[PDB]
Design a protein around this ligand. Sequence first.
Ligand SMILES: Nc1ncnc2c1ncn2[C@@H]1O[C@H](COP(=O)(O)OP(=O)(O)O)[C@@H](O)[C@H]1O
Ligand SMILES: Nc1ncnc2c1ncn2[C@@H]1O[C@H](COP(=O)(O)OP(=O)(O)O)[C@@H](O)[C@H]1O
Ligand SMILES: Nc1ncnc2c1ncn2[C@@H]1O[C@H](COP(=O)(O)OP(=O)(O)O)[C@@H](O)[C@H]1O
Ligand SMILES: Nc1ncnc2c1ncn2[C@@H]1O[C@H](COP(=O)(O)OP(=O)(O)O)[C@@H](O)[C@H]1O
Ligand SMILES: Nc1ncnc2c1ncn2[C@@H]1O[C@H](COP(=O)(O)OP(=O)(O)O)[C@@H](O)[C@H]1O
Ligand SMILES: O=P(O)(O)OC[C@H]1O[C@H](O)[C@H](O)[C@@H]1O
Ligand SMILES: [Mg+2]
Ligand SMILES: [Mg+2]
Ligand SMILES: [Mg+2]
Lengths: 316, 316, 316, 316, 316, 316
Amino acid sequence: PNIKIFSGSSHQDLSQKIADRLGLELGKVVTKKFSNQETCVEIGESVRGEDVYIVQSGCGEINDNLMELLIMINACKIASASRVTAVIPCFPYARQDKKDKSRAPISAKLVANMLSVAGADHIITMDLHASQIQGFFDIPVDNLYAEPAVLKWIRENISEWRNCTIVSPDAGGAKRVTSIADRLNVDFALIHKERKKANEVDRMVLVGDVKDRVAILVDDMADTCGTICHAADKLLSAGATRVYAILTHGIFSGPAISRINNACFEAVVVTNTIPQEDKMKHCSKIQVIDISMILAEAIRRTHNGESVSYLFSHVP
Amino acid sequence: PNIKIFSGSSHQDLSQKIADRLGLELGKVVTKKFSNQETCVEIGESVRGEDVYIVQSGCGEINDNLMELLIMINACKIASASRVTAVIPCFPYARQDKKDKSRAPISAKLVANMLSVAGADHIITMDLHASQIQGFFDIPVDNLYAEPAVLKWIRENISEWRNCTIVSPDAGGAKRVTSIADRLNVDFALIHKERKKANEVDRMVLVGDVKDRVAILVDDMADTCGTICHAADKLLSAGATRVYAILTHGIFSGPAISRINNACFEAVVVTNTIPQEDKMKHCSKIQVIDISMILAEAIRRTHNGESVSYLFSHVP
Amino acid sequence: PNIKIFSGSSHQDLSQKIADRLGLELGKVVTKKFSNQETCVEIGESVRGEDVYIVQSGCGEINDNLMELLIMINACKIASASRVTAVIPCFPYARQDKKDKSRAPISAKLVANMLSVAGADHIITMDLHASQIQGFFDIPVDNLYAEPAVLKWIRENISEWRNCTIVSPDAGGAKRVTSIADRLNVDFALIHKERKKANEVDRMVLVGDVKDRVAILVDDMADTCGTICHAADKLLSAGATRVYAILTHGIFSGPAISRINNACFEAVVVTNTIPQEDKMKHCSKIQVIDISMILAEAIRRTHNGESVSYLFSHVP
Amino acid sequence: PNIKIFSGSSHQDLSQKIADRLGLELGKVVTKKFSNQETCVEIGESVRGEDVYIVQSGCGEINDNLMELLIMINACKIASASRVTAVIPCFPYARQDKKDKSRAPISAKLVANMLSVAGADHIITMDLHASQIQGFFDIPVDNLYAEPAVLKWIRENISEWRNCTIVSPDAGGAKRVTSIADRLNVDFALIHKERKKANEVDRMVLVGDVKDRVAILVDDMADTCGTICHAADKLLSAGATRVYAILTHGIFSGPAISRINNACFEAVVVTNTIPQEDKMKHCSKIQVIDISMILAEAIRRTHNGESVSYLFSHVP
Amino acid sequence: PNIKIFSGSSHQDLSQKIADRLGLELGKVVTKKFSNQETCVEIGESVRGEDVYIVQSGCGEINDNLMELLIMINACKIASASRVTAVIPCFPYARQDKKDKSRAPISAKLVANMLSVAGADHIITMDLHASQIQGFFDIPVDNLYAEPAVLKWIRENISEWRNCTIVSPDAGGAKRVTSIADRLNVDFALIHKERKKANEVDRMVLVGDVKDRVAILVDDMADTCGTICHAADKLLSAGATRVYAILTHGIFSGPAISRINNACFEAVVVTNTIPQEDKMKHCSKIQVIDISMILAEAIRRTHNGESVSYLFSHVP
Amino acid sequence: PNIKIFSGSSHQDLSQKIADRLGLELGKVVTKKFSNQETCVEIGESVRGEDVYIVQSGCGEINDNLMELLIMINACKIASASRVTAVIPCFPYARQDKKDKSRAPISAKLVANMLSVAGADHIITMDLHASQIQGFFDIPVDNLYAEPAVLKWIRENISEWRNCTIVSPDAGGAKRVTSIADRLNVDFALIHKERKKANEVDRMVLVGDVKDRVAILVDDMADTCGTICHAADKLLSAGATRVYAILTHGIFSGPAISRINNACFEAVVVTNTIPQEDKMKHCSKIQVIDISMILAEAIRRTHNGESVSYLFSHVP
Ligand SMILES: Nc1ncnc2c1ncn2[C@@H]1O[C@H](COP(=O)(O)OP(=O)(O)O)[C@@H](O)[C@H]1O
Ligand SMILES: Nc1ncnc2c1ncn2[C@@H]1O[C@H](COP(=O)(O)OP(=O)(O)O)[C@@H](O)[C@H]1O
Ligand SMILES: Nc1ncnc2c1ncn2[C@@H]1O[C@H](COP(=O)(O)OP(=O)(O)O)[C@@H](O)[C@H]1O
Ligand SMILES: Nc1ncnc2c1ncn2[C@@H]1O[C@H](COP(=O)(O)OP(=O)(O)O)[C@@H](O)[C@H]1O
Ligand SMILES: Nc1ncnc2c1ncn2[C@@H]1O[C@H](COP(=O)(O)OP(=O)(O)O)[C@@H](O)[C@H]1O
Ligand SMILES: O=P(O)(O)OC[C@H]1O[C@H](O)[C@H](O)[C@@H]1O
Ligand SMILES: [Mg+2]
Ligand SMILES: [Mg+2]
Ligand SMILES: [Mg+2]
């Protein structure tokens, strides 16, 4: 079997980068819409007995892209592909990973079931919002970390990183922030927005010392940037000299760009798990860490039957 | 168990009509989008041990609506509903019902599998593009016909219906047209657009006599109205006095409204399996047959454990 | 893995032809009946890690043959075959492909589920009564066409084929007839037997012109030959000079042979998806198109991981 | 839900007896064959929300009957039956319950899987050839014993039953014979036909004393009656005064009737799990124990949610 | 259907309390071991059409208890129970909820799959180590909180609770601690043990102010009490006046009792999701919050088809 | 793919013998217990695309070992092993192979389902208590016989084996004993313990002649040795000169060692499907037949795609 890399409509630049790093051309696929807005998928080459990797991030037109991915997976399976792997850099519906409300769906589990029934044999993803999403499948799920790339960026772009403090913008980010602070041998802090019992002012509590130090906000994603912007205001109010925000998934939906442009961030750093070209044109603060080499190495090692553990300590 | 009727965002007027005919209020659901365009479903009441019917047509934002339906089905199932029925008046991806091309997906089968894995126990639909889609599920699938309502409309709105000829706009509609012509005891004709071997003019062949008679075009759906418009030009060129078009699913996507407005149709008749309010505002030729009574009777009989065979001979 | 071709009891001559065209000997199998008429299957060689193809048509003792096929598939799967493919030239129960009656089974879907649970990984079949039967499986299903062979036979055996008209014996055959007429660039006609509302005479309506022309009846199968015989009487009554019947599946059950012998057919042409040796001995009108080369090429390309699209335009 | 009893073509007299004992009329079903010998099933009444019991023994046209049963189960399931129970008095393919040969199918497991995929929720059967067949399903399987009826017949029809010896015709029947001998407080013996290493004479070894005593052969079934006839010759050669044969399943296929008529049996006693009317007309030695009351009580208790343990100690 | 409460061997006192609060006697079950240490389960009464709740905590002989629970679930399912619910107060293998190591199993997902294949229709559990474990099933999973009972205990047993600080013993407990601190309107702190890069001294970092205040350690479980004991030493070293530890699952395996007896805890508070009678006899610091009323109310509401949302704000 | 042999904690000496006979080192696995007695499995090497064989007998801590095996299977599957085979020399819960009691679980079927859901693709086992357990899986199950090794031991260790009688200790062993007696061309006898109707003395009935002959007791297993010890007393009381006991599974749980030491056995012969080192230290009568060569040959032939039928006639 040979590696066949197919791109959905979501992140075709990332698919191209992965294919170039693998020394391959992208597989021939026409991914369009019928007139009635139904997804049209036209695989333009044989995938018989091939090791098919479909790159599709959960971003942009989320349901459009997920349906595109499912249809492409099913087409490859029925076309007798040896193995179909869904490379989903940003897993859609990952934040709907539990039922903590009455009648609430576990949409991440539904997406996992849909991918399984479409015929996916393997999932490659980066920085799942909850790592337990790996357990939502009965197939192997690669949950790659952007943490080595984040550490590289911090050590190369922040002069006073050895005296910095890594800040969690919410309680759920504590593990990620503590891991990064341990790897950098720096202090960490946590910011919590307390629960909205009524319609008074949202107030943020900070635990840890950030006074007269550079604060690096690290989180898994910035959708509306309410979390990171509120954390940034709190950090400046607490005496932080400079505030950075580093995310792996830059969704930047809704008012995020205006929020960041009016915030105090020295830089907002995201990976290219989601296309950022449009976002960077309206926000100069955004910088992008390319993770295409990580995904390409993961695909290559999956095809060659080699461990991907190397990707959790080094940036290829 | 009690009937609980929930509406998706696709066709809420039809859901309201069904609920009124059942003497019920629509179940409390908030069906919106998160900022990143992920589907948000908030069922506002208990469905424990209830007989849940979710009305969602395949129309408008097709993938949005289908994801909404799947999430609502899964939420109801996890919320311990006694039974979850998907009332899908127009089945999405129904035209992708076979693999007659290399690497082509069977998207209808994928949609059926997704509905099954979401937890649907029963499907109620009207005039499946292919009746074999019933076989795409392992659960009961009600394939209701709009034919009795179509016959009622023909007998009440076309004065010379006894001398009319029912015309199939393509080869695939032949069974539907022959059934309608048999029930009306009238002649039938078939129109075929021959295959596009090269880039010459599309030419249509008509088998049957339509000269100096009213021609009624009957088809399962009109998406772009290319089929019915081309058939209408052919019918007028063949000597038909007046041309009607009767569909059960009025999709009217893309250039359909301009096509119909510039066509020669006496009337374009569709059911309300898809919302038509916007379409009727731009095309006076469109008239709507309400099928909400058929769907309401089907839901009521399903809940009461009664046969729906009555719906195939009478309009309630 | 190597190709292993196993024959059921249904069509062993076709299995032999396929094996010869593949340059193989048929796999050693004893397919008999126990005393109590239970199916006895004794695979006489190892199939470990082999690519097993089991040839069994739906014909003769239908349930006997289907049980034989299921038992052989399961034996091969438990015997650790790399892949088990059911080569079913005529799919049994294919006409029971929908539920258009109260309490009616979808027997084609049940057969598909039984084949899936027996362990079939791939289905190769010719001219499914409904192409949507491909969607009854979650495994790849090859629906081969006899149309290229039919076109070859028409062009080589009917002198006036360029002025002929291809006739559908019922409404459901319209797509097949229009496709053949397009490929031959000839006229087409359709014959419909209207629905039996009471016990009066069955009357047939013909749409299209067949007067003073050769009429070729093309259908997917002739079980009792009531359809083709009634169509032939109608065609002669309408002024057709000569009438041919071309089918892909010659079932010829019940009164079919006497019907054909007393009909006006110039020739009844079927493929050898079903054994015809016995039928030809009692009806001189029957001629057979060998499709063993099509099936052998399909099996060879499936084993070699090559596209079978070539089989839809050429007869090997 | 109400009890609905449907009969297949196999044993309709037993179905009638069960229905009469339940105070019900048999459900309206037409079970015939299409012209091409495909099974035709036409359920003539609604089974919506009903507790459906389908009676079909594995006998006669075995594959015909099993396909009939599967199609009826699937039709009832798709017709929205509350529960579908397969009442299979003699389980087909029960003797193919293991793989003790290379490439041998486990046909009993395949039949169980087919019944499960057809939609059976419950199996009621009598005296499975191997009780472990209960484990071939994931649904409850009632394995009823004919042993209480056998003990009743022995105590009422054999005057010297207290001095009799119960004889196993093979090694596999030892548990059944020991259980019966324990319940009767009588001696037991075992007869073994040693393995056919070459083409010499089949010789039978008897362990236990049967001299000058009545010998009762007890086995689960008599298909060809080779086992019981050879055992009877051995028992007479060993000095048994009279020889009885008691089976629960009288298959009597092939040469069984001539074998019994030429044997020395005082009586051959079978239950009516298989129709015996034809067999009794050609063999006066055959007597029938009616087990319809056992099956009717099992169905009634299953419907009422009551234990069937009473059936293992008493004959209702 | 009626509530049937069955106890495994793990926590029979809790099962008795639940049954008393439900006004029921525990179902008759013998749960012992065969001589070869295989689990023996003997359900002593009919569960036909019953709503069966099996109480079995993941504690003590973990694999013994889990196998007991699976066997009891399967026995109830095969015994035709209407519904089988596994009441698992402490979910076993819950800490193995992700694959963050090479070749690491997701044991929680395996346990969920085993419960699903045993036939569980519903899971009721308290304070899952990861709430995403709800997504490991395709059945409803009730993840009850001990938080209302914890808040009640804090407000009734700690005089200076309004000036206390709730402390997370690790980064993963941050959400639980922030929720509790929000509900009490008190400060919170977090303690992190940094990663063991080499064999130097384990050092703990504290973020937040605990000086001269009562510190309440809140975590989901205390297995070896290394986390809470190390956190307690850190809290005293940081100037906390008194230190409490509140857990929902008191596992107290290995050296936990000696660790607590030599620690500085004012009280170690656990629920009775795990039996604590033996632990309290050797550690006077341990106090138990009874949660049997929460579980009993959850079971009663599940049986009655009522929401359990009331249990997340009130202690019944 | 390469053979990877992994050992559980149950029988590591047998795993070592298998690995040596295969010329391999055992795969690196740490199989321990967490503090709370949860199974900890740490596979120490890549199994990507490997043919993994996990050796784990059902013995010792039965539930501990079975959970270990399931966790290791699941870890190998998620670690992308090409194929995972469970080598289970003594199948746990094999005696719970049917439901012959009210509410009784079929624990063997549950174990099979658990192995299937863990991801096992193949099962290799020796002398299943019921061969129908092969039918409890949908994957191939190798049921190897210790009979050739038993025959070798008899012919090499019992001087008067040609005049011996092979004795079944119960009715269920009759097939095994008759097969062995046929292969040795010797007499056979059967011993039955009649059912315990009340609390009187257990009495044993012997059918067959053992007077003044060596008696060889052959059974599939000796758990408590009650069966073989009672049979030995009966055989001596019946005039047997010497009594041997040959089992394939020596469980020897509970009072078995004291029972054997106080019995009259010339030798108790078992295979090493279960570790016997501890048992032999307290009972000199126990001798061990090594079957590691049989298991190693089975694994090697499974990997090489060769028949294992040779293992049923010869000891490698
Ligand atoms: N150091 C690590 N940190 C986090 N996750 C890891 C780590 N090592 C492995 N994983 C997880 O395990 C998966 C597979 O691990 P890998 O080392 O590539 O080999 P294997 O597939 O045999 O376990 C990765 O995709 C990742 O999800
Ligand atoms: N021209 C065609 N007309 C009809 N069916 C086709 C055609 N081409 C392909 N198919 C269908 O697609 C199946 C597989 O197509 P093929 O071209 O062999 O490659 P792939 O399996 O990769 O799709 C065929 O078995 C057939 O059912
Ligand atoms: N005494 C018995 N001997 C043999 N099988 C039995 C016996 N009692 C029960 N069974 C088996 O258990 C099944 C169901 O048992 P039953 O006592 O009716 O209640 P439950 O279904 O709750 O177990 C029966 O159909 C039969 O297969
Ligand atoms: N306030 C809440 N906090 C956390 N989990 C909740 C809450 N409300 C509901 N849940 C979760 O949802 C499950 C079921 O919710 P409930 O309100 O009882 O009704 P429904 O089952 O219809 O959703 C609970 O068992 C719990 O896991
Ligand atoms: N002589 C035999 N006696 C008993 N069981 C056998 C015998 N031959 C084969 N089997 C069973 O069949 C299984 C596989 O058989 P084998 O001959 O190795 O080839 P195949 O897997 O192709 O059937 C064995 O593992 C065993 O369970
Ligand atoms: O401990 P024991 O019961 O004596 O030995 C196990 C026996 O139980 C079962 O019948 C096995 O076939 C053996 O004969
Ligand atoms: Mg967060
Ligand atoms: Mg059409
Ligand atoms: Mg923790």
